[PDB]
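Researcher: Last one for today. Full complex below.
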Amino acid sequence: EKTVYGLNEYAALDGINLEVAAKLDTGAKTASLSARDIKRFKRNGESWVRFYLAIDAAHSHPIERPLATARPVIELDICMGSAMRSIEVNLTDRSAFQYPLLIGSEALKRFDALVDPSLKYAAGKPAC
Amino acid sequence: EKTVYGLNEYAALDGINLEVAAKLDTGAKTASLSARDIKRFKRNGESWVRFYLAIDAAHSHPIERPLARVSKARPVIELDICMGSAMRSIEVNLTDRSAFQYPLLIGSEALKRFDALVDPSLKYAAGKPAC
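Model: Here's the assembly. Have a good evening.
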């Protein structure tokens, strides 16, 4: 398949039931997620990370993931429109990043995406 | 008129027989052109700029263009850029970036002017400039 998306879309981090506004950035290779209170730990010998979305001020959706300018990288099932893809994401502790999720060129390739710069939120709400 | 291009394409500045590597960047709004020896001057009272492409080290293709504005520092001009078979008047900031990086960075506004769809799985899909 090959789906057309816009400069910005709504994405859902599957499993955490959270809708984030995503900026589709073909100039960046890797994807980025704005996070807060990033804590690295070990679980049964495997490197893991625990964090909240930068938007989750109430700390309602703690996210614990095994580990997949030097940010930890994890794999997240992200839903955009009707397309669900496992995406590699760098957890950044910055917050000046306006868009909570930055989707780079590699993730966009995983999404089979064509970016129309004249469109915004063309996929509607996530419905995977 | 929605044409599909890739992450990188070859672009030509109309009139100039030079291959420029363009990175199609939907994350940036404005377009950028890597330039060298940028000299601002005045012609008939209007601000003009004379410069060479960063690849043109020998100063073989001097470029004189009227200044459109000044960004927030960098000189801004309008250039007829050719990509594949599409010729578009594009606003570009003249930057002194390293010749290492991509000489032409095509932002979202220019991609909109090109009626472009960016396929991140493709590279140089438009072939050589032939406008």
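Chain B has one domain: 3-119. Residues 3-119 of chain B form a domain with the Cathepsin D, subunit A; domain 1 fold (CATH 2.40.70.10).
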